[PDB]
Amino acid sequence: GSHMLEMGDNLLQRIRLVVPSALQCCDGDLPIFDPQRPPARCVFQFNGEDNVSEAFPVEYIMRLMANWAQVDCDPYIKIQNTGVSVLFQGFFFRPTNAPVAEVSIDSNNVILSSTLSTGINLSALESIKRGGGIDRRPLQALMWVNCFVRMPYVQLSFRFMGPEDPSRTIKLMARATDAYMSVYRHYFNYIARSPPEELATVRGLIVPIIKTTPVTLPFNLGQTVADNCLSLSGMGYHLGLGGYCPTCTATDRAALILAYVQQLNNIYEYRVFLASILALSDRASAEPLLSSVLAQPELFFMYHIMREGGMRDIRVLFYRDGDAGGFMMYVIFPGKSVHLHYRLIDHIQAACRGYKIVAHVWQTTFLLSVCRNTVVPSIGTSDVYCKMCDLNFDGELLLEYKRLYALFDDFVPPR
Ligand SMILES: [Zn+2]
């Protein structure tokens, strides 16, 4: 009689239970759910507002739904950029032409533009799980989707999470199988009796199973998400999770434009910037060259952000951009290792919108290439040229730029 209505509500309530509150439930008017005839329409919806950074327990919800259904199904969850928010939409079967993300353990990031969407179903999730050798024991490794709502964009990351205490989870599955006497069914029937213990269990999957991921150079920083850091060294090329990176754990558009028009003041701050233009003047007056580089204020933004972020010993090289005109810039890192804090990557991406930032390695030197793909008030070229004449430059600095321009004259950004 009423049982069927109760079975469906118990499901949706347990789903809403495990979804963090920042992703607000926004379901409409839903019908009665028949386990033997699961619906094909959308069964739940959760919404994340702009600037939200939260994780969705995609795998747990999928397996909960598969456990509820008394027939074969392939739970599918669609992740959509609404233009003002991220929208998670759940289904028992993937709609006809719904998208499925092409992700793996190592390539796990997805960036959605405005109005676009991606998705994933339990079948694809399981395939990714068995290809990466992930632990398949129930509750040892479940996938979540970390979302960083950064309108007009939505950043996603498909990550496998695990328990802080695996032994505490092996014992839970031991008590669940005892009461019952796949193995997931034992857990879901047991945990159905204690919503509090179910919440505590899902909220306990908070240990990333893959804290670092390899990348291939050249690496476009546009493939990162807001909490990704980047490490380049003799240990390889890796993306990290800002929260779980030991190095990491250890200014809007206005302030950037304000820094460009106020560069003449605190001339020492970008002494290293002007010294590059001197060294570039030799090879082939310097005033028309200085004007061209200042016509690309994003290049100054990058240099300003790098040093505000602690990367004080960087060097910048300017090369004519054959395609877009003007100049591209190489940020040369010192030494044989570099770590870009996740906050720094976020900053340089926002500051240089319209420019591609790509990490390279050339002649034992790590670098970023900044190539062109809101008006900034122009400054007086002559005002900067005159300050450049009065500035003093040590020979070591000028020789450094001599060696660097000679070293990178043969460097060709793959693009
Ligand atoms: Zn880091």
DSSP 165-193: -HHHHHHHHHHHHHHH--HHHHHHHHHTT
The two tokens of residue 340 are 């870009």
How buried is 15 (Cβ within 10 angstroms: 0-12 exposed, 13-18 middle, 19+ buried)? buried
16: left (phi over 0), alpha (psi -120 to 50) or beta: alpha
CA of residue 179 to ligand 1 center, whole Å = 44
CA of residue 310 to ligand 1 center, whole Å = 14
Cβ pair 156, 146 in contact under 8 A: yes
Say how far apart CA 329 and CA 203 lie, in whole Å. Answer: 45
CA of residue 73 to ligand 1 center, whole Å = 40
Which of 340, 344, 348, 268 lies closest to 300 in space, CA to CA?
A: 348
| Cα 69 versus chain centre, distance | 34
CA of residue 227 to ligand 1 center, whole Å = 9
Is 339 known to sit in a ligand binding site? yes
Is 245 known to sit in a ligand binding site? yes
CA of residue 248 to ligand 1 center, whole Å = 4
Core vs surface per residue 67-97: b (16+ CB within 10 A) or e: bbbeeebbbbbbbbbbeebbbbbbbbbbeee
SS (H, E, C) 294-356: HCCHHHHHHHHHHHHCCCCCCEEEEEECCCCCCEEEEEECCCCCEEECHHHHHHHHHHCCCEE
CA of residue 119 to ligand 1 center, whole Å = 28
Say how far apart CA 126 and CA 131 lie, in whole Å. Answer: 9
CA of residue 245 to ligand 1 center, whole Å = 5
Which of 204, 169, 199 lies closest to 184 in space, CA to CA?
A: 169
Which of 401, 412, 404, 376 lies closest to 258 in space, CA to CA?
A: 376
DSSP 76: E
Helix 195-202, helix 183-191: angle, nearest 10: 130
Length of the chain: 415
Contacts 24+ apart (CB under 8 A), 386-392: 387/264, 387/267, 387/274, 388/274, 388/277, 388/278, 388/286, 388/290, 391/267, 391/271, 391/274
CA of residue 336 to ligand 1 center, whole Å = 16
CA of residue 247 to ligand 1 center, whole Å = 5
Strands annotated E in 20-99: 23-25, 44-49, 53-56, 76-81, 85-91
CA of residue 405 to ligand 1 center, whole Å = 30
Is 42 known to sit in a ligand binding site? no
The structural domains of the chain, with segments of one domain joined by +, span: 3-209, 214-408
- The bridge status of strand 355-362 relative to strand 53-56 is unpaired
CA of residue 231 to ligand 1 center, whole Å = 7
Say how far apart CA 206 and CA 161 lie, in whole Å. Answer: 6
CA of residue 244 to ligand 1 center, whole Å = 8
CA of residue 249 to ligand 1 center, whole Å = 7
H/E element holding 63? helix 58-68
CA of residue 242 to ligand 1 center, whole Å = 5
Say how far apart CA 169 and CA 242 lie, in whole Å. Answer: 26
Angle at 320 between CA 318 and CA 325, to 5 degrees: 125
CA of residue 346 to ligand 1 center, whole Å = 13
Say how far apart CA 120 and CA 159 lie, in whole Å. Answer: 13
